[PDB]
Coordinates of all heavy atoms in Angstrom, one line a residue:
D1 N -7.3 22.2 1.3 CA -8.7 22.5 0.9 C -9.7 21.7 1.7 O -10.9 22.1 1.9 CB -8.9 22.3 -0.5 CG -8.4 23.4 -1.4 OD1 -7.9 24.4 -0.8 OD2 -8.4 23.2 -2.6
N2 N -9.3 20.4 2.1 CA -10.2 19.5 2.7 C -9.9 19.3 4.3 O -10.3 18.3 4.9 CB -10.1 18.1 2.0 CG -10.8 18.2 0.7 OD1 -12.0 17.9 0.5 ND2 -10.1 18.6 -0.3
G3 N -9.2 20.3 4.9 CA -9.0 20.3 6.3 C -8.0 19.3 6.8 O -7.9 19.0 8.0
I4 N -7.0 18.8 6.0 CA -6.0 17.9 6.4 C -4.6 18.6 6.4 O -4.3 19.2 5.3 CB -6.0 16.7 5.4 CG1 -7.4 16.0 5.4 CG2 -4.9 15.7 5.8 CD1 -7.8 15.5 6.8
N5 N -4.0 18.6 7.5 CA -2.7 19.2 7.6 C -1.6 18.4 6.8 O -1.7 17.1 6.7 CB -2.2 19.2 9.1 CG -3.0 20.3 9.8 OD1 -3.6 20.0 10.9 ND2 -2.9 21.6 9.4
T6 N -0.6 19.1 6.3 CA 0.5 18.4 5.5 C 1.8 19.0 6.0 O 1.9 20.0 6.6 CB 0.3 18.6 4.0 OG1 0.5 20.0 3.7 CG2 -1.0 18.1 3.5
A7 N 2.8 18.2 5.6 CA 4.2 18.6 5.9 C 5.1 18.1 4.9 O 4.9 17.0 4.4 CB 4.7 18.1 7.3
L8 N 6.0 18.9 4.3 CA 7.0 18.5 3.4 C 8.2 17.9 4.2 O 8.8 18.5 5.0 CB 7.5 19.6 2.6 CG 6.4 20.4 1.7 CD1 7.0 21.6 1.1 CD2 5.8 19.4 0.7
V9 N 8.5 16.6 3.9 CA 9.5 15.9 4.6 C 10.6 15.4 3.6 O 10.4 15.1 2.5 CB 8.9 14.7 5.4 CG1 7.9 15.2 6.4 CG2 8.3 13.6 4.5
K10 N 11.8 15.3 4.2 CA 12.9 14.7 3.4 C 12.8 13.2 3.2 O 13.0 12.7 2.2 CB 14.3 15.1 4.0 CG 14.5 16.6 4.3 CD 15.9 16.8 4.8 CE 16.1 18.3 5.0 NZ 17.4 18.6 5.7
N11 N 12.5 12.5 4.3 CA 12.5 11.1 4.3 C 11.1 10.5 4.8 O 10.5 11.1 5.6 CB 13.5 10.5 5.3 CG 14.9 11.2 5.1 OD1 15.5 11.1 4.0 ND2 15.3 11.9 6.2
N12 N 10.8 9.3 4.2 CA 9.6 8.6 4.7 C 8.3 9.3 4.7 O 7.6 9.6 5.7 CB 9.9 8.0 6.1 CG 11.1 7.0 6.1 OD1 10.9 5.8 5.7 ND2 12.2 7.4 6.5
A13 N 8.0 9.8 3.4 CA 6.8 10.4 3.3 C 5.6 9.4 3.3 O 5.8 8.1 3.3 CB 6.8 11.1 1.8
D14 N 4.4 9.9 3.6 CA 3.2 9.0 3.5 C 2.8 8.7 2.1 O 2.2 7.7 1.9 CB 2.1 9.7 4.4 CG 2.4 9.7 5.8 OD1 2.9 8.8 6.4 OD2 2.1 10.8 6.5
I15 N 2.9 9.7 1.2 CA 2.4 9.5 -0.2 C 3.7 9.2 -1.0 O 4.7 9.8 -0.9 CB 1.8 10.9 -0.7 CG1 0.4 11.0 0.0 CG2 1.6 10.8 -2.2 CD1 -0.5 12.0 -0.5
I16 N 3.5 8.2 -1.9 CA 4.5 7.8 -2.8 C 3.9 8.1 -4.2 O 2.8 7.6 -4.6 CB 4.8 6.3 -2.8 CG1 5.2 5.9 -1.3 CG2 5.9 5.9 -3.8 CD1 5.5 4.4 -1.1
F17 N 4.6 8.9 -5.0 CA 4.2 9.2 -6.4 C 5.0 8.3 -7.3 O 6.2 8.2 -7.2 CB 4.5 10.7 -6.7 CG 3.8 11.7 -5.9 CD1 4.4 12.5 -4.9 CD2 2.4 11.9 -6.0 CE1 3.7 13.4 -4.2 CE2 1.7 12.8 -5.3 CZ 2.4 13.6 -4.4
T18 N 4.3 7.7 -8.2 CA 4.9 6.8 -9.2 C 4.4 7.2 -10.6 O 3.4 7.7 -10.8 CB 4.6 5.3 -9.0 OG1 3.3 5.0 -9.2 CG2 5.0 4.9 -7.5
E19 N 5.3 6.8 -11.6 CA 5.0 7.2 -12.9 C 4.7 5.9 -13.8 O 5.5 5.0 -13.7 CB 6.2 7.9 -13.6 CG 6.7 9.1 -12.8 CD 7.8 9.8 -13.5 OE1 7.7 10.2 -14.7 OE2 9.0 9.9 -12.9
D20 N 3.6 6.0 -14.5 CA 3.2 4.8 -15.3 C 2.6 5.4 -16.7 O 1.5 5.9 -16.6 CB 2.2 4.0 -14.6 CG 1.8 2.7 -15.5 OD1 2.1 2.7 -16.7 OD2 1.1 1.9 -14.9
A21 N 3.4 5.4 -17.7 CA 3.0 6.0 -18.9 C 1.7 5.4 -19.5 O 1.0 6.1 -20.2 CB 4.1 6.0 -20.0
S22 N 1.4 4.2 -19.2 CA 0.2 3.5 -19.7 C -1.1 4.2 -19.2 O -2.1 3.8 -19.7 CB 0.2 2.0 -19.4 OG -0.1 1.8 -18.1
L23 N -1.0 5.0 -18.1 CA -2.1 5.6 -17.6 C -2.5 6.9 -18.4 O -3.6 7.4 -18.2 CB -1.9 6.0 -16.1 CG -1.8 4.7 -15.2 CD1 -1.3 5.1 -13.8 CD2 -3.1 4.0 -15.1
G24 N -1.6 7.3 -19.3 CA -2.1 8.4 -20.2 C -2.1 9.7 -19.6 O -1.5 10.0 -18.5
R25 N -2.9 10.6 -20.2 CA -2.9 12.0 -19.7 C -3.7 12.2 -18.4 O -3.4 13.0 -17.6 CB -3.5 12.9 -20.8 CG -3.6 14.4 -20.4 CD -3.9 15.4 -21.6 NE -5.3 15.3 -22.0 CZ -6.3 16.1 -21.6 NH1 -6.1 17.0 -20.7 NH2 -7.5 15.9 -22.1
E26 N -4.7 11.3 -18.2 CA -5.7 11.6 -17.1 C -6.0 10.4 -16.3 O -6.7 10.5 -15.3 CB -7.0 12.2 -17.7 CG -6.8 13.5 -18.4 CD -8.1 14.2 -18.8 OE1 -8.8 13.6 -19.6 OE2 -8.4 15.3 -18.3
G27 N -5.4 9.2 -16.6 CA -5.7 8.0 -15.7 C -4.8 8.0 -14.5 O -3.8 8.7 -14.5
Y28 N -5.3 7.2 -13.5 CA -4.5 7.1 -12.3 C -4.7 5.8 -11.6 O -5.7 5.1 -11.9 CB -4.7 8.3 -11.4 CG -6.1 8.4 -10.8 CD1 -6.4 7.7 -9.6 CD2 -7.1 9.0 -11.5 CE1 -7.7 7.7 -9.1 CE2 -8.4 9.1 -11.0 CZ -8.7 8.4 -9.8 OH -10.0 8.4 -9.3
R29 N -3.9 5.5 -10.7 CA -4.1 4.4 -9.7 C -3.9 4.9 -8.3 O -3.1 5.9 -8.1 CB -3.1 3.2 -10.0 CG -3.5 2.3 -11.1 CD -2.7 1.0 -11.2 NE -1.5 1.2 -12.0 CZ -0.3 1.4 -11.3 NH1 -0.2 1.3 -10.0 NH2 0.8 1.5 -12.1
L30 N -4.7 4.4 -7.4 CA -4.6 4.8 -6.0 C -4.5 3.4 -5.2 O -5.2 2.5 -5.5 CB -5.9 5.4 -5.5 CG -6.0 6.9 -5.5 CD1 -7.3 7.3 -4.7 CD2 -4.7 7.5 -4.8
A31 N -3.6 3.4 -4.3 CA -3.4 2.2 -3.4 C -3.3 2.8 -2.0 O -2.3 3.5 -1.7 CB -2.3 1.3 -3.7
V32 N -4.2 2.5 -1.1 CA -4.1 3.0 0.3 C -4.0 1.8 1.2 O -4.9 1.0 1.2 CB -5.3 3.9 0.7 CG1 -5.3 4.3 2.2 CG2 -5.4 5.1 -0.2
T33 N -2.9 1.8 2.0 CA -2.7 0.8 3.0 C -2.4 1.5 4.3 O -2.3 2.7 4.3 CB -1.6 -0.2 2.7 OG1 -0.4 0.5 2.7 CG2 -1.8 -0.9 1.4
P34 N -2.4 0.9 5.5 CA -2.0 1.6 6.7 C -0.6 2.2 6.6 O -0.2 3.1 7.4 CB -2.0 0.5 7.8 CG -3.1 -0.5 7.3 CD -2.9 -0.5 5.8
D35 N 0.3 1.6 5.7 CA 1.7 2.1 5.7 C 1.9 3.2 4.7 O 2.8 4.1 4.9 CB 2.6 0.9 5.3 CG 2.7 -0.1 6.3 OD1 2.7 0.2 7.5 OD2 2.8 -1.3 6.0
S36 N 1.2 3.3 3.6 CA 1.4 4.3 2.6 C 0.2 4.5 1.7 O -0.7 3.8 1.7 CB 2.6 3.9 1.7 OG 2.3 2.8 0.9
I37 N 0.3 5.7 1.1 CA -0.7 6.0 0.1 C 0.1 6.2 -1.3 O 1.0 7.1 -1.4 CB -1.3 7.4 0.4 CG1 -2.1 7.3 1.7 CG2 -2.2 7.9 -0.8 CD1 -2.4 8.7 2.3

């Protein structure tokens, strides 16, 4: 939607999804470094 290409990869994705129940239904954390999102 924002003009950024994507690819589904088996290994070494750029985005790491993590689960933290303390963030509840709608909270989130973001960390962006040169190595990963």
